Assembly symmetry: C3
Homo-oligomer: 435 residues x 3
Amino acid sequence: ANWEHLLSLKRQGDTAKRLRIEQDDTRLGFEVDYDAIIFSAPFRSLQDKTQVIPLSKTDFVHTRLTHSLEVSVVGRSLGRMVGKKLLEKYPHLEQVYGYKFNDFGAIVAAAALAHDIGNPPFGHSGEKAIGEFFKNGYGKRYKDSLTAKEYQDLIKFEGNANGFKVLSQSKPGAQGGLRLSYATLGAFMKYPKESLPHKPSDHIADKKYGFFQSERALFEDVAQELGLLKRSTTDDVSWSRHPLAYLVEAADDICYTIIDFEDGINLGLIPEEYALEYMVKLVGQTIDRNKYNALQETSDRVSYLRALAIGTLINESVDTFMKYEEEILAGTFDQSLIDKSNYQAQITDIINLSIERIYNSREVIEKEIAGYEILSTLLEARCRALDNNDTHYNQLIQQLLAPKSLYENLIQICAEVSTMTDGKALRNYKKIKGL
Amino acid sequence: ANWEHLLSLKRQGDTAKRLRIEQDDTRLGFEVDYDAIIFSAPFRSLQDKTQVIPLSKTDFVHTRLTHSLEVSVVGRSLGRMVGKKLLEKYPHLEQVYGYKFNDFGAIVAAAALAHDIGNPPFGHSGEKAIGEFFKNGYGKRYKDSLTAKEYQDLIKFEGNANGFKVLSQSKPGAQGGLRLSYATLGAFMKYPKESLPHKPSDHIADKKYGFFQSERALFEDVAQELGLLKRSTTDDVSWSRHPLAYLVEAADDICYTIIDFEDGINLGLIPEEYALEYMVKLVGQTIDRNKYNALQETSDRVSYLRALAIGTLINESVDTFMKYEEEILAGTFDQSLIDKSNYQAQITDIINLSIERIYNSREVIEKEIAGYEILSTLLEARCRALDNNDTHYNQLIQQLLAPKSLYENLIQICAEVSTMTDGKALRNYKKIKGL
Amino acid sequence: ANWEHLLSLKRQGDTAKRLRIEQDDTRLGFEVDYDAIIFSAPFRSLQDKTQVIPLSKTDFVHTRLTHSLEVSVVGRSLGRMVGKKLLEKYPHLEQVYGYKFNDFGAIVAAAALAHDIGNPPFGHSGEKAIGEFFKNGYGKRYKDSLTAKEYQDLIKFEGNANGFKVLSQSKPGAQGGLRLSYATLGAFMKYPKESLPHKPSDHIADKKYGFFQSERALFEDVAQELGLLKRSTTDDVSWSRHPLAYLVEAADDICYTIIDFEDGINLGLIPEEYALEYMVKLVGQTIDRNKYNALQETSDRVSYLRALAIGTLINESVDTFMKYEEEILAGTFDQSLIDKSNYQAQITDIINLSIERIYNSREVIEKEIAGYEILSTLLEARCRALDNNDTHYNQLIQQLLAPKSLYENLIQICAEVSTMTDGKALRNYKKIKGL
């Protein structure tokens, strides 16, 4: 591929090319993208969306908005640092085409900021509850009216794909959604494939899929404009990742690992006695141990460790990207940047500690179990209303929850149930069940 | 038809005639009816029964008892003014028979006071939830054990017909229920027909039905004594309305229109800026503009407009009655009194604004949806216990909720679930669901 | 039967005999049993387990722990008093084998202390909900995969048998459970039979059953060591009760009769006047009338009557036991000790009043109805997770509720659901239901 094409400023529906050298640097398309997301209704709704991790009465624990905000700050740093090195490697990108190192920071930051925008509540358990509804619940009745891939979109409903829908969905008065730059949509697409075939290889980009059938035509346009390399020549389409999607992924990987740990310690789910032991290798060269011992509050000690460890992993991930830059550009890199880390054993240890103390904790399990009932109830009410829209009750349901082809109706129901705020979903659920 | 027979003082089971001229003026049968309703357990229970309209923590919103009381006051005025004009047009009713203008006010007031006594909770949505239970829910299993009209009583369960049952149902030690005058029972019956045929015409009197199969024999006796005109000779019975039922209907129509509007403004669902605009034509000939401007509080200004509009519509309704009095006596008036109003456009505008801002409001929809679940759960508990009364659990349900033919059992279950107070229904529902 | 064998100090797994004369007086096996129950997790859990009797905002009402404690105190007196008379009638028990009167008090106290340890919540209605689950609910699907007696253990699930399971269940690191002395396990077994045949006679010992199929081999060991007399002629096994089981029963009967009455008066469910009227014959010979009239508080007057009445019935039960000692030893006593009471008319009056004012009270019926839903919901969740342990949801359920053969799994599910504390059961129920 070519970096000039990968850094496309095209917005959906454009009729003429947007050259970087002609951009107003105070209205740079990539930076406009970031601000568009910040002010968007879907991003703002993350304020009222918790993570599956429990709340604390005494200490800070991230909601989904502040988690996404911090991921985007890590992403900006990754993009800035790699962008500087790319412009040194390929100086024509700056001298001829006018690209600057902050462009790469803005692309990665915007795609990272919006990564969780489409995820249902209750973490991956919420995805599994939606999928189960269509695999074995009421929604199984729709199988024979859908293509294999349309049905797969439902039984393996994917928040990454719903995020792509949220960013690009046309509505009356708003064609093309947020109309983000194609470079940003490219960096967003960690899994550039459809729902089938399912996990066709052990390649990182094949672990999930990244767009629904409803968004296939758009990503085809995005992939064409960017020049992404093909990974399939059948009607089951798939492409090699945009190089910057590796940085978006690394930002998420760094933040899932270290910031979950930080939250677990502040909640007390992870004993503070383990804080230094698990972070020593990651921070040992830079930690000022005398300073660490002088900090009097648990949360200040763990924030210092988190800052040091994120710094270490950012610097390393930049160097790993540049080492494998040609292979990434050629589509032959089959792993994540963090997979190559010299700290991979320590990262796995932290992740396993978080699985054991946070995600397997009673408070998380209880919430996932409750979430199954909440999501299954909302989906069933919407789907019965779709199937019998004439009855008095189902008209009330439509008025309460949602005031096209079968597939497009079903994927919209999933999309809308997934993006309801915590409070709205809970209130509507309680009314349907009379509580 | 003859007004001498329409004004019957007969009570259920009477052995001898009751002549108006022989009545004690301090114990007039029609006034005794008003007081019997006031002190009755069903009317007292309206204290603990809310309308579908939401509660407010700052302003007055009507419960069902206050609504019924104000309807009865408007009704008394309609009856008084019409009674005076009817006694001028038929002076023998006063000379030979001894009827006085207050008699007509008493009949209309008592019938109007009792109009909502049999309605289930949650408004018309509550009626629909009970019907759905027998149409498509657990109660569907009874269809093949019931006649067409018995089943129709259930799938189209009607609060008007339940009100007639509540007023007249014999119980051990209370033969004939409240034993109201037959004239009052006639004025109560807005839909003098059985559940089938369903809407045989577009006449307002055919829109619903007014008695269940369980009360058909009772209303036949009332219809015979009053000399109501038979409107159909098939096994399907129906009669032309008692003339005073047009005034009972008018009392409800005027209050439903204007007082919902008043509550909507005080709730903030309807902006105050709409209050004068929608009521100027109805009040302009009688309003004291100096008084209106001096009033500094919204609820006082709205209450003033409400009083003037109601007075306007009462006066117009009386004139409309008297214009079509002979048509009403002949059974050939196919319309409501308010349908002939010169302010029909303004009334329709007020009704539509109330639908848009009150009845389609989120708080009303939520409550109606919850009411479906509450009523369906209580009905299913009672019917499962009816079908299998020998189990330990169903014996507990019987002790908790209810400490004859299949049809008579099912209609009683509906009547009882419909008349439980809000708090008792909710408490029993929560216990059944373990909440 | 021989008292030397009936007073066995054997613990499960023992390879050598335990001679009473060799026991350390500060570590007597029978007294060790009492202390082992007190400190056991199942007994401690009765702290957080209420009776079906409603709680009071003004007066004392017993939780299950305090009820079991007071039953054990009454049992200790019964055992001590009968022990002294037994050692007079069989002096070789002391002189040759070294038994002392307090040994009999310790046996009866320990067995009585543990009588309610296995009962499910919600009283006998809780037992009926569990049985109904397997007779007609989801659990009916297991009938054809179980023997007749295995299925009867479920459809007639019995708290007495679950108590035996709780006391003796082997787990890794705790073989034989609490490892109680066999004399104590004999005194505990009021119904020495398996689930089938059901009520083979009207003998009190045949009213219920005392051990599940999972514990049949253990009680067979216990019966052999104690030398209990075989009572059943068929392949369904059954033994005559250990004589001390009659005293454990009498402690329960006396406390349930008088202390329930006491609680009902202090709750206000039973009018205060009924206290002296129903207890005057039980207390007349021993009551200090000036002490009683000087007492100014209801709870103190009633507590005085309770102490006097329990005193009377303890003394009488001891005399009844000794009067029929030889018939009990030979297995020919067909009644309970209290059945032979001279105060049986007063006991029956008190029980019937408690049934009418307490157990048939609205507050109890409400709680039993809710308990059906709670227990049925928990049983269905555990059984569906047993049937499909592979699904993501069922693996969450397994982590939340339970972090071998089909029968062994089902009886363990019943045992665990029955032994959950009130708050733990309610919390898990609410999460499964989304609240």
